Amino acid sequence: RQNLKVLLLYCAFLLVMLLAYASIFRYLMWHLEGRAYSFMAGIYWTITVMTTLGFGDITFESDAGYLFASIVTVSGVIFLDIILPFGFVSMFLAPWIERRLRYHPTIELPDDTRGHILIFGIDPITRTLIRKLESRNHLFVVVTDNYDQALHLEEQEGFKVVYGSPTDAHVLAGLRVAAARSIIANLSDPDNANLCLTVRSLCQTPIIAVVKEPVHGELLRLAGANQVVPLTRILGRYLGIRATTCGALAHILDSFGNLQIAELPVHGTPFAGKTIGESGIRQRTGLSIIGVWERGSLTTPQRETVLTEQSLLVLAGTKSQLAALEYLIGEAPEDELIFIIGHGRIGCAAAAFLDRKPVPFILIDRQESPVCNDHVVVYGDATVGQTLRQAGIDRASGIIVTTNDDSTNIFLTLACRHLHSHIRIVARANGEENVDQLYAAGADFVVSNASVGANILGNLLEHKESAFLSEGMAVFRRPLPPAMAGKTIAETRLRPLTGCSIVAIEAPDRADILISPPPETILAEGARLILIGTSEQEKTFDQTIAAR
Amino acid sequence: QNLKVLLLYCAFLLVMLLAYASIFRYLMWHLEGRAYSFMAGIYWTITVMTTLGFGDITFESDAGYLFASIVTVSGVIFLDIILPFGFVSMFLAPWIERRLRYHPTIELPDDTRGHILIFGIDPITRTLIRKLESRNHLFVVVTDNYDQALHLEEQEGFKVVYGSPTDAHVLAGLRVAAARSIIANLSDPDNANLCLTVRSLCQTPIIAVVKEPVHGELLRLAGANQVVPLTRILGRYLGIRATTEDELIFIIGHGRIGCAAAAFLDRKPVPFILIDRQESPVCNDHVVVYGDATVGQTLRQAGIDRASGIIVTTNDDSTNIFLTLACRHLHSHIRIVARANGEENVDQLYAAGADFVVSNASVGANILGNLLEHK
Amino acid sequence: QNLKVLLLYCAFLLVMLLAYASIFRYLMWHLEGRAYSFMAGIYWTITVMTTLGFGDITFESDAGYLFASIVTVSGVIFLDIILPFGFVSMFLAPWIERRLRYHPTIELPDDTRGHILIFGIDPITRTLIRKLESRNHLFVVVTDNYDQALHLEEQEGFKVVYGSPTDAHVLAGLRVAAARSIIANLSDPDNANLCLTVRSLCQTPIIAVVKEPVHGELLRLAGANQVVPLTRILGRYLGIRATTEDELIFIIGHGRIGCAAAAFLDRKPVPFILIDRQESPVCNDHVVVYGDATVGQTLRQAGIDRASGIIVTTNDDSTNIFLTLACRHLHSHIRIVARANGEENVDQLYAAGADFVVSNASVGANILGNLLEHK
Amino acid sequence: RQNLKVLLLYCAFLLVMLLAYASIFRYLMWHLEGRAYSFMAGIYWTITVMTTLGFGDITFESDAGYLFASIVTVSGVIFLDIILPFGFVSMFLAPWIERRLRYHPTIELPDDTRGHILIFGIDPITRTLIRKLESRNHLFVVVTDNYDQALHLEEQEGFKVVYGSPTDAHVLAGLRVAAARSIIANLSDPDNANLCLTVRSLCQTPIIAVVKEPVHGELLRLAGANQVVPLTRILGRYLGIRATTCGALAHILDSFGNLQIAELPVHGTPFAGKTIGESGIRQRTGLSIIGVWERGSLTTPQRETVLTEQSLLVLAGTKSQLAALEYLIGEAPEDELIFIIGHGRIGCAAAAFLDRKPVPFILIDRQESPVCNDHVVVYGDATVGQTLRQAGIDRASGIIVTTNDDSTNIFLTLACRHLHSHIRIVARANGEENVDQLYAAGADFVVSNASVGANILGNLLEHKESAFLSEGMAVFRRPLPPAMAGKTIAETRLRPLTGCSIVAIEAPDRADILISPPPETILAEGARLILIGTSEQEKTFDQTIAAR
Ligand SMILES: NC(=O)c1ccc[n+]([C@@H]2O[C@H](COP(=O)([O-])OP(=O)(O)OC[C@H]3O[C@@H](n4cnc5c(N)ncnc54)[C@H](O)[C@@H]3O)[C@@H](O)[C@H]2O)c1
Ligand SMILES: NC(=O)c1ccc[n+]([C@@H]2O[C@H](COP(=O)([O-])OP(=O)(O)OC[C@H]3O[C@@H](n4cnc5c(N)ncnc54)[C@H](O)[C@@H]3O)[C@@H](O)[C@H]2O)c1
Ligand SMILES: NC(=O)c1ccc[n+]([C@@H]2O[C@H](COP(=O)([O-])OP(=O)(O)OC[C@H]3O[C@@H](n4cnc5c(N)ncnc54)[C@H](O)[C@@H]3O)[C@@H](O)[C@H]2O)c1
Ligand SMILES: NC(=O)c1ccc[n+]([C@@H]2O[C@H](COP(=O)([O-])OP(=O)(O)OC[C@H]3O[C@@H](n4cnc5c(N)ncnc54)[C@H](O)[C@@H]3O)[C@@H](O)[C@H]2O)c1
Ligand SMILES: [Ca+2]
Ligand SMILES: [Ca+2]
Ligand SMILES: [Ca+2]
Ligand SMILES: [Ca+2]
Ligand SMILES: [K+]
Ligand SMILES: [K+]
Ligand SMILES: [K+]
Ligand SMILES: [K+]
Ligand SMILES: [K+]
Ligand SMILES: [K+]
């Protein structure tokens, strides 16, 4: 762009100069030597001289003619044998060499940059989040204060990289944080708090902070973070619900204090092997299966779908409906013993979850935790022989192998399954390239940090236009009033009246559900609506519909 | 600079032109009995060297052929070989040694005068530079570290010299004798070495920033004209702000500043508590409650509740900001005095809920500022 | 490779030549009633584009002038612009991306077959390469470390690929399915990961060098076709040489080899003493006399006098050589069995006074050698 | 060289091609068009075509003539517009860019390399040794196995740098160690032993090893080292002789078991302030002052020379003559107390020397020595306040400030002199750039590691042709027999008869001495000769002279 314009601007200067010299030529040939030449001849002569061809078939004879001829001759050499290669090599090659042998850090962002997503702090989580939304061509800009990292990130793109201090208000100004679509804060908790307070001093751009410690979640929202995601707490929890011999209800949300969302692993449950409509969950519980999660895919629950030992049911309903489901499972086995290998922030949260039930566990680690003081840990290297044995791995019922190193996880899953083919093995994969090999080692289930983290962050980014909306709001369930038995969503006009929105429409005697129904959906009789709105519109709901 | 070699070549070319134009007329006359003008000789010579070659004026003798061949070869060598060979080996060569492979400045120009030498760059001296740009001094920072020299070279408001600060030959190339003033911001043993070395050459005014107030006397002995104990000053500020019976002040951070704060609150005297994750390697006169403050219980354990004031003094601004948030979140009214290492974090410490913020960069640069003006 | 783009251009140029030579004759005829030969058209066209410009054959019409101008401009663009622009941006450009800034090979050519993948380069596998060069295999070493890739690139007898050994997409680009054999010389957890990943793609024979004999069974489970416990073997060798009552053997070095030596001398059984500067991070079944052996008294303290044999087993050949000298200098006849990490130090261990020398590189490469031949 | 030859070989190809085309031109012009042109015309035409000038005044008219003309035209462009710039840029610029932006390690040395000095292991010692003999233009080649060090050393030269494993026999082969003049082994003791044993497997080139531990001196000579230099032991010793309040005799050599060399510091001695001939040392001792060392200069002792508080007398004589001198000093002060700051290998040797007298000392250090177990050390940081005070620095009589850090040394010398203007301060300078500032701090004497080490190594390199000669030999002293009273050294023929050599000739009643007298020196009556020879020629000395 910038260089091309200067390139053909030079072509316009030459073409003008050509016509100039061609005209002066015809002029002088007439007024000095009494020769009349055509316009074409003038162009023909001028080109002949500049290109240094020099046929000599049209030449001057006077000194003044020699003078003009010499000038046109030098002009050609200067502007076709000197400037043209030099001008080329300086405007073209200087960028091409300097920028390719010598990393020039992107210190700023173009002023016209709008609707971009600022990523702070790169890791397998955000690394995956980028790659999964780069398939979507989202304008991603990751920032870092590490020189040796910026150029590394420049090689696999992907994305754009800005090198500067994430907390610096001036660096943020050059990042155009005001025009930003969203901001992912994945630095340490003290750094994130610094980032949020600084961003808030410039704009109100929505920030998603990935809090390094569940306690610091409150402090980050105070800093200005519109959303807070405790990964390890969630990741550890996901390691835990899978670790038990028989699956149990896992409470997710208790909004509105009457409607709850809860997930349930199907492994070890009576629902394992049967289909959804066969087990009759909604039938005996009154719940709403709002999705079946299996192998990284949230699918619409159908009666044909066969629940496997690796499934996960997303459920919604009242408080007495969840307790009705826990009754059907219904009891947990006795004398469970869960070995948790690795005592980091994830391994800790894994035990923390298993303690909220509670279930007797054992922690094994190489060193003393610098953060936790509430858990008892058996100190020892899980690789060195007899270390697991002496800890009493024999009477264990399940093992959570959660180490910061994947090859070690794979090696422990490999060894444990080799010694105890019976016990349940849950493995943790830091990188998603190691997930398959963990299953191949003998693990019954694998929790991938990167993928799980990317899904959460991603969904919070896609549903962003309704994220801070749905935040501070309460989801609710209303049985379709017999008045609208046969009316269309667009015809009913629910939103302009009440203010809420239809997120789900399920049939009377069916586990089948219609997630996010289009306005042209024709409602039926006995259907059960699941809506989302403010804790003010939920009360002005039954008010508005009955009073029109 | 490269101009002088280039237009000298143009001078030689111009001479070679007139020389060839002259011989042309002389030869044309004596060789073949032809009388050509001066412009004809210029026009002919140009036509030959530029290799245009109109052929309208050509010799017919062997002596004329030889000459023509000589002028032709000259046009090739001195326009199609040397002229481009010059180009690349005159200012495309310094282009690689200064833009493709970082070339550190190891010495200043001989005539350099009225410049300010900065030894040991930090947020304080970095701010001292951008605070005196309106006076338009020439700030030169000197570092014995290669990597630091490179980072300080891409961003600029000052000059960057790479070499041993404590070397006499390096100080000589820095033209210290012609310097306006020198700022010593290295460690105490280094500054002592820096002064004694400078004093062997010149008597340039030295403003040394001392690490321990006790060492201040020694730095004067070395040769410093002024000594600035900032952490005593910065520590004194934090202590003054924390106060202006049951009055308990928490000092979170037991470094040289935090220590100076505690040392100040002994003169009042006001009871205090020092919390740190590590035992001070320089101090053994204060009592420190050990344990990391970010973890959690330590603030509640030591009793942040019955405290009247809090002083957050960590070398990490992000940590400070985080602690200021936590304290303000726990006790919504307690006096919180925070420390700012960089001036970029001052606004966020107040946003976090601090009642007063002391900036090391601001206070530091202001003192060093008012010492370079009232020299 | 760049040839094909270059001579295609020569083909285009040749076509453009004949095209211009043809139009020339056609125009000369129809425009000005002149009949020129084919060679005249070639000769004229060349003369114009090369900008020689004899002017002996020139048009006199405007249509002829236009054409001449077009052929002239073409000679400039397609010989003085594109021809050099091609040059620089065709094989002077790969010259910078491969000789001025190290470009690591991240993938092998699609057709690559019969190659041997080496995972984890060391004096053993480095010797395995230079020991099978007469068979002319294609050895490719793979390292996830940038710096190591660069050092292994300047010196060569093998191919160097940079990337994560435990990545499926990286193994796919290494064409493991077409590989002759794979050598796993990484840590035990890594090899387990390496095998399980390879087995998901292909069933290429894997020769895994296991770190702990107990883990050998696990590596077979992972997918290895052969497992080689060298330190057990190397330790066994040292023990066999140390012997073939009051017989005391000193083992200087308590690593996995030294441990294996001690583990072997328990089966005999022959009393021994293990001397090391550090407690073994993997072993807790042997008794080690702690203290550095180079310092001095430790050899005299433990009683190197009443010993019958000495086994020097340190991961440092220079240390070994030095200890072998010291022992031979103290006791001029005592049995000294030394360990050689590299094969370059074997001769100096004997020169130092060793009675027999076991070379890790030699023994290692020979086993791995006879496993790739009798596949 | 290599590139220049290819350059003007191309000029010879062109000149031949010019003459070729010029000849074929005249040939064709005759046989094809009946035109006769001169030799000059042919050159004139051919040049005109190749250079693309193209006057057109001499042109062909036939097709065959057009064919030849076109060939010469293309030939010119290929060989003056294509090959000439390309050939240039590939033979010239490729070395100039690649070798200047990308370090190409010198892996080998040219076969014809003879009489070079191989330096192994670079440090302030060898760094100085190089710079001091690079003023002498000695062919120095330093070797290293550190990639990030080889290119650093390439920037300040000085010297040439070979990058390879010093112990590798193949790397040594490429270094041409056989043709080497000498080898300086300055690696660790285990590495040096490896180096020597390897070099000895190839050649018998003299090796000077710098042993890191005085005990390992025996083991290195066994490895093949022709010479062994314990620097710290020597450096520590030099710190010690200067530390005492009053100087004392320091025994250097006891060769032949009757002649000894010994040095003596003049500080605190009665000789301080007076001249050599005034104190009358040779007079009252019978010794031979073979040199006066002051301020880095070994000068010939003259009666005019004034001994200062910083002088050092190099002496030679029998065993009873040295004891006669210690009598003249003659006694040491009482209750001396020497504080030695820093307990490394040098600080250790300093105490080791002070214990061989003995003199009560105190050691202070930050940490426990990993090598020594014989000395008691007061653990503490000498920078932190009251640390020296509590150790009892008050009743000390002298301080040896010997730290690995010069700025610290300077800062301690500065502080100690400020608190105790009376006590003697000996300081250690790792780098010679810090020597002057140590004196400026208040030190009474400074021992520079680099300079002292360079002098020893240097003298062992210059006197190399007589180093291994004088090694294993015994220096002796013989009173000039009255028979040669008036005869010249060359006339006497001492060497061809006995086998020894005259190294010194001193006068009867004079402290003046003639070091290394020229053969034309006319001997006198009563002169005292100091010779050097084998322990076999010293006995065949008095035998040969008396029996002719
Ligand atoms: N709290 C959150 O929800 C959240 C959110 C976003 C990011 N993060 C960040 O993600 C990080 C993830 O936590 P993590 O990766 O540090 O936890 P981690 O479990 O990976 O920590 C590793 C632990 O495993 C142990 N270990 C390693 N090898 C072992 C072996 N062979 N035998 C026994 N033990 C072994 C070590 O002792 C160590 O304690 C957190 O540190 C946090 O900063 C956290
Ligand atoms: N003589 C003077 O007045 C003067 C003047 C200018 C400069 N200086 C120099 O400036 C330097 C700056 O001092 P400084 O910045 O290192 O002092 P500092 O107070 O910042 O020291 C840092 C301390 O904070 C603590 N810390 C860090 N993170 C913590 C956490 N999460 N929880 C609890 N504690 C934590 C550490 O234990 C550490 O001791 C000084 O070393 C001094 O030499 C001195
Ligand atoms: N299962 C197998 O048989 C097998 C096969 C091939 C490879 N391997 C692997 O090869 C690796 C190589 O083992 P290694 O070379 O580390 O064993 P090692 O014997 O060389 O271990 C080194 C030890 O020598 C000691 N040491 C070093 N300097 C000393 C000194 N100056 N004085 C006294 N002691 C000193 C250290 O304490 C250290 O423990 C092993 O880790 C192993 O995993 C194993
Ligand atoms: N033995 C020989 O003669 C010889 C010959 C050639 C080379 N060398 C090598 O030269 C090296 C020189 O020895 P060195 O430099 O390691 O000895 P060193 O005296 O420099 O070691 C430094 C010591 O000073 C102490 N120290 C540092 N700061 C201090 C402070 N503020 N207060 C108190 N103590 C402080 C440290 O504890 C440390 O022990 C040797 O290690 C050896 O390898 C030796
Ligand atoms: Ca894998
Ligand atoms: Ca900030
Ligand atoms: Ca060797
Ligand atoms: Ca100095
Ligand atoms: K031309
Ligand atoms: K003509
Ligand atoms: K004509
Ligand atoms: K021409
Ligand atoms: K021409
Ligand atoms: K012409």
Ligand SMILES: [Zn+2]
């Ligand atoms: Zn815990």
Ligand SMILES: [Zn+2]
């Ligand atoms: Zn303190």
Ligand SMILES: [Zn+2]
């Ligand atoms: Zn063992």
Ligand SMILES: [Zn+2]
């Ligand atoms: Zn000692």
